[PDB]
Design a protein around this ligand. Sequence first.
Ligand SMILES: [Zn+2]
Ligand SMILES: [Zn+2]
Length: 143
Amino acid sequence: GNLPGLNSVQSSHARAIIGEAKKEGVGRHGCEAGIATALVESNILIYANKAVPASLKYPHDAVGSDHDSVGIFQQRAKYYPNIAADMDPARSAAQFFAKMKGIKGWQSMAVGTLCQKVQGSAYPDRYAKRVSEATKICQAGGL
Ligand SMILES: [Zn+2]
Ligand SMILES: [Zn+2]
């Protein structure tokens, strides 16, 4: 059925993230970072943004108005110009994991801090508060 604490939509999205974690070989630690980030930024839903016209032309579970942030990871269109990718769970995850891997020391870095660095966020506390669930969800997905 569904993953721990996720409805069927969130579950679908998380499975796509977890699947890309396997493909990219980031292990549970990587998966924890991806899911924890997804929970904070969007609660694992695909957001569009009025501020980015092209994003309304892709399937989305809701609309938000944070900067030019789009998708599950709230990747800024400024920096991530391919909106198709930003609005696709698997491809958007690949974009997260790609940046995460370029961070020297990520494999043994605390998850909260790792998400902060990847997202350019100002506080790790938000992501850290979500790791317990991210683990449960990653485990249930096969990582
Ligand atoms: Zn870990
Ligand atoms: Zn700003």
